Nucleic acid binder design. Structure first.
Lengths: 70, 117, 66, 99, 88, 271
RNA sequence: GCGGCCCCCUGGACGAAGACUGACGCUCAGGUGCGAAAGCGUGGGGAGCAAACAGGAUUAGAUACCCUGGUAGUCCACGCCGUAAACGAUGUCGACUUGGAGGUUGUGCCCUUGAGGCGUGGCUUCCGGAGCUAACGCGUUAAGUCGACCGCCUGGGGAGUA
């Protein structure tokens, strides 16, 4: 997006603020999706397998990590 | 040698170059310096140090225009923005505000097909 | 939690410009219900209203555009 | 007999030419059957994007219970009267009261 | 979609009295009214296929109610087929 | 509409003809008629100037009002005639004061429709206006090129001019050829597209249809002798030559726009 | 299969309390209708992408991937085709048989006493109990225990070809 640097401000914190605005608004992620075309089969496969990844990490996280290792 | 003391900097970075164009407020460009002009051909064109030497030459190219304070616009992904905005104040400048103005389509057109290899 | 089930409104109406400045981000994007916790039907009515207000030049589409 | 929020905008300068139009917009509706239920002029205020190269358009809200066909003819005026710049007619459940 | 007042008129045009709304002539009368309105629609748009499935479903249910009534009480069935205006 | 003829005989085998019920089965209105002799392509020196013209049916000229000089008075459409001179069906409009006049019938037009001309009337299909009251992005027909001349462009069946732009006194039209043009804004134009849009879908079947259309046979170059046509002669179909018209100028590619005093109006040449 | 916004026309499902007809039901050979993409027909449109194609590379070779171009097509209307890994590889309807977590959409009661808790529905996702199964797994949406009706299979190849 845009940031503003006001007076009496270090430049390096403004550079890091700009990187944070880039991470927040989404330049990199949507650009990385929009280099080359994805057929709607593959975007459906992506979102569905991501949902399986979220619950197949999550249920192992909630109930297989409640018992100790050693 | 037309004195315009303030200005805007466009930093177009794709994955294969880094073109830095220092322009006035009204859009009239004053001279540029790409990452690929100053030597730096092939795989050494896309390094962030190429953006550093590009902004380096681009800052010294406009000494007759008396640019004392500038506004950074950046456009595109890839090894551009960070190294060139770090170099653009080691060059000696007063960057008053920084913006990312990358062009995003709102699901407009069809991008080309996927590179298999 | 939510602000609309805690309010009790039967439709988030687009004319409510203060909270419909609240619910988008700085960059004019609709912030999801995952991170704000808005319930689903009020999320859909809120997104519908923000689109209808974007057409009405009371909200920006993105920030950067002239 | 349906209830429509008609929201339209006019130029910045022609706020002298807005009000009597609403009056013939009154004659648009109550001439046939139409009950006008609100009139809240938001007036000239500032735009998030300059449609036809101008900020600060004139917002006029108007709510109506009316037959549909005079609203079809009202859109045939909203297309071709070259003062009104952006104009949507949405359908609602009831005729409402407050701002 | 055959608003309630038209249904009230036709159920006080075919029923035993006001409230008997589930008898067979009433159902066939509602289906014939709905069919004729929707044939007013389908002369235009020509390809609204989901509304075509709804229409073919109420045609088939009209046909089922009519030959049920033909099996049970033929005397009411001939009065219905002469009153509501259809071929078979 | 467009119907195919059942192939009882070859001339009926290939015919696809356009039937239309709205056309008035009857003799046309008489005071708007006059006689119209066929020429055969022969000027006052008697010689053929344009070949492949002659014969066919005899036909009478329907005087059609393109000017629309009557203003501010309403009119209603009595009936639709079939005109032999042109590709669009015409309409006999009747004004309220008592006048009957032939107009070019647009696409959306049935008998009993209401039409008013002038600078006032409306934006309905059928109404004549200047090109200062017709909005940008519109779709017009029967466009004047000179103020008061009568109406030149977009007069065939189904053609239409999209009004693109307006810079001061000038209106940029996108013509049907693809050419862009500046025209004067004060010129008249009628809204809508011209009717009979299925006119391109007739295929005439046989030789006699183009013959009684008013068109003679067309003889190829390679058949003729080297005196008659530059693609003459040969021992059994040699060609060898760049294609030309019978009068030397090379056809099939050569541009000959040679006006030079009207290029100020052309924004874009056809591509 | 459907993805900005708005109106016009319209199908269907769900929930509440009731009111009404009174077995009007289920399934379906043949038949008919809908049926992604590609493809065909005539007419418009044609930005981006891109079969075919051309050129540059890579390679032993490369009429492939990679790169630079690029015509059909993709788009709209009206007709045709009638096929797909047309895939929960699971016919349709109905019944019975412990659970826990979730999603969406309702509704009833109590205090809204306070973003509430308390019960009844519909559709849907995950793990598992009995039971079944060659195992994998399914597991109240069954591949469990049953009933009705339809379709289908009989070694692989020939071949869903003549």
């Amino acid at each position: 997006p845009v940031i503003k640097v006001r007076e009496n401000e270090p430049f390096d914190v403004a550079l890091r603020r700009f990187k944070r605005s880039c991470e927040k608004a989404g330049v990199l992620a949507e650009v990385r999706r929009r280099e080359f075309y994805e057929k709607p089969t593959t975007e459906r496969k992506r979102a569905k397998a991501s949902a399986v990844k979220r619950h197949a990490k999550k249920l192992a996280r909630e109930n297989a990590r409640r018992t100790r290792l050693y | 040698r037309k004195q315009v003391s303030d200005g805007v900097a466009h930093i177009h970075a794709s994955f294969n170059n880094t073109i830095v164009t220092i322009t006035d407020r009204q859009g009239n460009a004053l001279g540029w310096a790409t990452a690929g002009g100053s030597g730096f051909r092939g795989s050494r064109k896309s390094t962030p140090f190429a953006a550093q030497v590009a902004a380096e030459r681009c800052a010294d190219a406009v000494k007759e225009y008396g640019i004392k304070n500038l506004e950074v616009m950046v456009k595109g992904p890839g090894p551009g923005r960070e190294s060139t905005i770090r170099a653009l104040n080691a060059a000696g400048f007063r960057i008053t505000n920084i913006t990312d103005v990358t062009p995003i389509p709102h699901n407009g057109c069809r991008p080309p097909k996927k590179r298999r290899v | 939690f939510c602000r609309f089930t805690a309010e009790g409104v039967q439709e988030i109406d687009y004319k409510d410009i203060a909270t419909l400045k609240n619910y988008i981000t700085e960059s004019g994007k609709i912030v999801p219900s995952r991170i704000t916790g808005t319930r689903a039907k009020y999320q859909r009515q809120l997104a519908r209203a923000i689109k209808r207000a974007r057409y009405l030049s009371l909200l920006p589409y993105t920030d950067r555009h002239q | 007999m349906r209830h429509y929020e008609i929201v339209f905008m006019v130029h910045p300068d022609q706020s002298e030419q807005v009000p009597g139009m609403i009056e013939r917009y009154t004659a648009a509706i109550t001439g046939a059957e139409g009950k006008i239920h609100r009139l809240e002029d938001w007036g000239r205020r500032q735009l998030a994007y300059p449609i036809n190269k101008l900020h600060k358009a004139h917002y006029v809200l108007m709510n109506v219970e009316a037959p549909q066909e005079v609203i079809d003819e009202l859109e045939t005026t909203f297309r071709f009267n070259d003062a009104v710049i952006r104009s949507m007619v949405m359908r609602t459940k009831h005729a409402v009261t407050e701002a | 979609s055959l608003s309630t007042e038209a249904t009230a008129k036709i159920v006080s045009e075919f029923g035993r009295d006001a409230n008997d709304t589930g008898s067979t002539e009433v159902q066939v009368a509602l289906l014939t009214a709905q069919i004729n309105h929707l044939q007013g629609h389908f002369a235009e748009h020509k390809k609204d296929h989901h509304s075509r499935r709804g229409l073919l479903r109420m045609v088939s249910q009209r046909r089922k109610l009519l030959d049920y009534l033909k099996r049970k009480d033929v005397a009411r069935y001939t009065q219905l087929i002469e009153r509501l205006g259809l071929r078979r | 509409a467009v119907v195919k003829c059942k192939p009882t005989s070859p001339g009926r085998r290939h015919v696809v003809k356009v039937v239309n019920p709205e056309l008035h089965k009857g003799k046309p209105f008489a005071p708007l008629l006059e006689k119209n002799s066929k020429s055969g392509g022969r000027n006052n020196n008697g010689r053929i100037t344009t070949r492949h013209i002659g014969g066919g049916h005899k036909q009478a000229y329907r005087i059609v009002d393109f000017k629309r000089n009557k203003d501010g008075i309403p009119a209603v459409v009595e009936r639709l005639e079939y005109d032999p001179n042109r590709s669009a069906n015409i309409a006999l409009v009747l004004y309220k004061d008592g006048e009957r006049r032939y107009i070019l019938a647009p696409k959306g037009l049935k008998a009993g429709d209401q039409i008013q001309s002038g600078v006032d009337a409306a934006i309905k299909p059928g109404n004549t206006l200047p090109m200062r009251n017709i909005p940008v992005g519109s779709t017009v027909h029967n466009v004047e090129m000179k103020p008061g001349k009568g109406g030149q462009l977009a007069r065939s069946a189904g053609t239409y001019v999209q009004i693109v732009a307006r810079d001061g006194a000038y209106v940029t039209l996108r013509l049907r050829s693809g050419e862009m043009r500046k025209v004067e804004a004060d010129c008249r134009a009628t809204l809508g597209e011209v009717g009979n849009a299925e006119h391109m879908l007739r295929v005439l079947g046989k030789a006699g249809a183009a013959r009684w259309r008013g068109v003679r046979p067309t003889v190829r170059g390679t058949a003729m002798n080297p005196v008659d046509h530059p693609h003459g002669g040969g021992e059994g179909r040699n060609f060898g030559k760049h294609p030309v018209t019978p009068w030397g100028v090379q056809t099939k590619g050569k541009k000959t726009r040679s006006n030079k005093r009207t290029d100020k109006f052309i924004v874009r040449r056809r591509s």
